[PDB]
Every structure is written in C-alpha cells, then in structure tokens.
C-alpha cells in the first residue's frame, strides 16, 4: 500500500502516545503527542511526527477526510480537515502521511497541533521548538512574490509519499492503566475492550487471556488481580515518550513521506546603489531595503574587507584603492570597481 499509502500505514495500528503537556499541565497517551518535528530544508517546511496515523480510516482507507487517531479503543477516527497547526499563527499545512504531518508556519518558539475527533473541542498539544526564519540570500525578506531572484534552496520535497527513509515500528504495547478488571463483591472480572488486558494477577483470573472478553476469578480483591496490555496488527511509532510496553522489538518499515528535494527560491534584490567617486574613496549611498547584509572587499593584496547588515539609508565609505575594491552590497551581482 503505497499509492494508497494507507496499506503500509495501516499494517501498523496507528495508536496514541504519551504527551506530558497539552494545555497547562495535562498530557496523557493522547493523539496530541508530537513525537519529532524535523525540518531539513532551506525552503522552510516543518515535518512533525504526529501521534495518530492521520489519513487512514477505520479500515485504513486512503481517506482525504480521514485522521486516524487513538482512543482507549484503537479507532479514534477524526476529520482530516479539522486538524490545525499553529506556530504563532495558523501555519499552512501541506500534507499528512500517517504519523508524519508536513506544513509551513511563520517564525515562532513552539508548534501547537489541535484536532477534535469525537472529543469536545480540539484536543491539542503544543511542543516547544524554536522555529527560526533562517533564509539564504543577500537580503532577509520573507516575500516570495518578488520578481527579483532565483537561488538554490533545499526543502522537504512535496512528492507523493512512498518512502525515502522509513521509520521503524515494533512493540505492540502494553499500557499502564488497569481499570478494566473490577471486583463484583468477591470476584475479579476482566471484560473485553480496546485495551488488551492480559490476565496478570497473583492467581486466578489474572493468569491468562488478553482482554477481548470477560474472565472471572472469585476470591478476588483490589490487590491480587492484575491487568496487562497486549496488541495486534501494529507496532509502536518509536515509543518516544511511549513506555516500551512490549517484551521485544521487531521493526516494520513506514516510508517517511515528504522526502526532501532540492528546489529553487525567489529572493528579491533591493535598489542597487549610488557611487560617489573621490580621491581613492567612494560613497555607496544606499537607501535601505528590507534589510540585508552588504559586503565590500578590497580586491588585490591583503584585502581590507568588511560586511554590514544595512538596514537604513546611509553611505558606505568603500575604500576604492589602486587595485580596486569588490563591493557586493545586497542581492545583486558581486561587481566591484576600479579607481575612478
């Protein structure tokens, strides 16, 4: 399942993960866990790892409306459209392949993901990650629509997800929450549900059987009975927070969608300059632009060379020696001049 990538995606049960902070103190094994947010690109894209396998339906169909999240039972289905990412404002989402979501957001200190699947009002976590605005270019302006430049820049290439590098799955987990087994006045009883409660107690009903059905063990109290967690048709994402609730690890391959590609970008070039000649000296009267680092080197010998982040109307004293200086003041070509 690659074209409909939900085949390889739903070979693993996309289950919830333990977020510690989701709204001023609380964080449980919800879908609001951000496993890892990596952005390997000069294009400014965030590739976050999301706890649920968003995009796969209850049958793991290629669902444009699908957002496969977790509940106490595995099928915590949600709207694929209702998901929201916000860095400092709502960052523009690009796509989702299972647990790997990809989008573009403005500069900020953390990314917040919020989705309400059946729950009340957008269960959302917010991971601290100081997203910078680190762009290349002689200037430093975030405006794509300049008709000025074309430089090479990396990005998370937006191709259709099969794989370039896969994340490994393993450990159908055992949870840390045993409210399934209860006592009827002398007897432990373990019902069946979306948590596979292996009978794990001192003796009795806590001896065998994953929680797919009820098992009774009389003479049962609060202490001597034990739950356990078991799974099927899946392995955990990484168990990043994810308490390793398996006995052994056995990887599966999930092709990390949005494999990175090198593309181009458009950088605007500012108003060029004014050169005022003099006796071995020149005044580079630059009115400012969106501010950028302009550099002037002295071509020849042990070269007087400087560079300054120009952000105001000024005049650079370019020393224009006999050999000449090389002044690249802005996003223009690096052209420097000779004497006079």
């Amino acid at each position: 399942s690659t074209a409909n990538h939900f085949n390889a995606y739903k070979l693993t049960r996309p289950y919830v993960a333990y977020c510690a902070d989701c709204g001023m103190g609380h964080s449980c094994h919800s879908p609001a866990m951000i496993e890892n947010i990596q952005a390997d690109a000069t294009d400014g894209t965030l590739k976050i790892q999301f706890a649920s396998q968003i995009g796969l339906t209850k049958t793991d169909t290629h669902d444009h409306t699908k957002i496969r999240y977790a509940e106490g039972h595995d099928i915590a289905e949600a709207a694929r459209s209702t998901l929201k990412v916000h860095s400092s404002s709502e960052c523009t989402v690009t796509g989702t392949m299972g647990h790997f979501i990809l989008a573009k957001c403005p500069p900020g200190e953390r990314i917040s993901v919020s989705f309400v699947d059946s729950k009340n009002e957008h269960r959302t976590c917010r991971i601290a990650y100081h997203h910078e605005q680190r762009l290349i270019g002689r200037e430093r302006f975030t405006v794509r629509p300049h008709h000025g430049i074309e430089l090479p820049c990396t990005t998370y290439q937006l191709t259709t997800a099969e794989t370039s590098e896969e994340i490994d799955m393993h450990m159908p987990p055992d949870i840390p929450d045993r409210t399934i087994l209860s006592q009827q006045s002398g007897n432990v009883k373990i019902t069946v549900n979306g948590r596979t409660v292996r009978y794990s107690s001192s003796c009795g009903s806590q001896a065998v059987g994953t929680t797919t059905t009820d098992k009774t063990i009389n003479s049962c109290t609060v202490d001597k009975c034990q739950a356990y967690v078991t799974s099927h048709t899946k392995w955990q994402f990484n168990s990043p927070f994810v308490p390793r609730r398996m006995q052994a690890e056995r990887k599966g391959k999930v092709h990390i969608p949005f494999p990175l590609i090198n593309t181009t970008c458009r950088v605007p070039l500012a108003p060029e300059a004014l050169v005022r000649s003099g006796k071995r000296e020149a005044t580079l009267s630059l009115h400012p632009i969106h501010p950028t680092l302009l550099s002037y080197r002295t071509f020849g010998a042990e070269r007087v060379f400087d560079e300054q982040w120009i952000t105001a109307q000024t005049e650079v004293t370019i020393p224009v020696p006999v050999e000449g200086v090389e002044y690249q003041w802005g996003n223009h070509k690096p052209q420097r001049f000779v004497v006079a």
Binding site: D40, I175, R178, L181, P243, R303
Partner: protein, 217 residues
C-alpha cells in the same frame, strides 16, 4: 526507544552497538497510562533506557565536508592572436600539458606563485568555504565544529564525542530524559564564519565543484 520497563521487576542492562549507544536502568517506575496494566507492581520496577548516537539522515542529502589540502595548479584559457591565427586555447598552467597551437607550441609556466586562497585544512559547507582548525579526526571536543566527525562521507564508522547524558525520569510518564549536548553541526552552521569568497586576497572567486579559486589576481 520505548524503555524496557519492568512494572514491577528490575531488569538487566544490555549494551547496544551505536557510537552514542549508552544505556541505564533507573529504579522506581510507576506508570499511569490508559491502555492495559503496566504499572501493576507497587515498587521494584526498573526503566532501562538506551540511546544510540546515529548520523543525521540529511547527511546523504547534505553534509559539511572539511578537507586538508596540498598545492594546486593554475589553469587558463589564453586567447592567442598570432597574426592570421586568432583562437583561444585552454591548458593547465603547471607546465606539463603543453598546448599545440596551429603551428604554435604553447607552454604555460609553471608559475611558482602559491599565493592561493587554499588554507591548511579548509571546510566546504554548502559551497561555502572557510579555512579553519579542523578538529582531531574523530578526536573532536563536543560542542564545536565537528561534534560528530566523518571518517568517510558515507563512511561506515561514526566518530563523535557528543555529550549525551541520560537521566532518571519523573513518575507516571515514561520520560526517558537524556541530556544531549548542543548541536555542534547546527552550532557550526549557525555561527558560520566569513565565506571563502569573503576576503579572498587576489580577488579570485572560490568556486567548488572542485574547490578552485577562479580569476586569480
């Protein structure tokens, strides 16, 4: 990975094979999840957690090389107007690759001028040049340019001294806290120096498909 948690039950301590593969078993786990019984012992449990220092996945996409350098040779195309002959002829100016002009025997140099912007051991990062002190080859100090050294660019072994330090987590959640050092590769990319083209004496534009400074004044 997901920590080997005995809940209850102490564990052993098996060691991985990674370069930063360090493991540690803290005691006193008390898991409070919502998916089956895992915090089912009142005490005596143990959380064994191991980290493994692996190379970054974007390295094959983009790494930051640093090579030492022996001397190099000037290579020029000379437009020669020898009367009725008027052509252009390229040649390495080392003196060996003598050009055969149309009846002309051109020999270029070899000119002995090592005023060249090749440093002792320069690094090429994204096409940027910077001559600087390369670290110990595998013996680098953590938290600098070269926190994970490269014996080979796609090399099998991985040499680094990155400061990972595991820590015993807090209760309830599986917080496998591992205090890693700062990212020196980011800390060498960010906090970059002047470019190789920056401050090029003789004004030659350092261009590196192969690292050569064209237009040598």
């Amino acid at each position: 990975p997901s920590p080997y948690v005995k809940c209850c039950g102490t564990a052993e301590c098996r060691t991985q094979d990674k370069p930063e593969y360090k493991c540690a078993v803290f005691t006193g786990v008390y898991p409070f999840m919502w998916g089956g019984a895992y915090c089912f012992c009142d005490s005596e449990n143990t959380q064994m957690s191991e980290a493994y220092v692996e190379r970054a996945d974007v390295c094959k996409h983009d790494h930051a090389a640093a090579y030492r350098a022996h001397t190099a040779s000037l290579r020029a195309k000379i437009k020669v107007t020898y009367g009725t002959v008027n052509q252009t002829v390229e040649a390495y100016v080392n003196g060996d690759h003598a050009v055969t002009i149309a009846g002309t025997k051109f020999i270029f140099g070899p000119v002995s001028t090592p005023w060249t912007p090749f440093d002792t051991k320069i690094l090429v990062y994204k096409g940027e040049l910077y001559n600087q002190d390369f670290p110990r080859y595998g013996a680098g100090q953590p938290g600098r340019f070269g926190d994970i050294q490269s014996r080979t660019l796609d090399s099998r072994d991985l040499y680094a001294n990155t400061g990972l330090k595991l820590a015993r987590p807090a209760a309830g959640n599986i917080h496998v806290p591992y205090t890693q050092t700062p990212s020196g590769f980011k800390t060498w990319q960010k906090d970059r120096d002047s470019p190789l083209n920056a401050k090029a004496p003789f004004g030659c534009i350092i261009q590196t498909n192969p690292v050569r400074a064209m237009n040598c004044a």
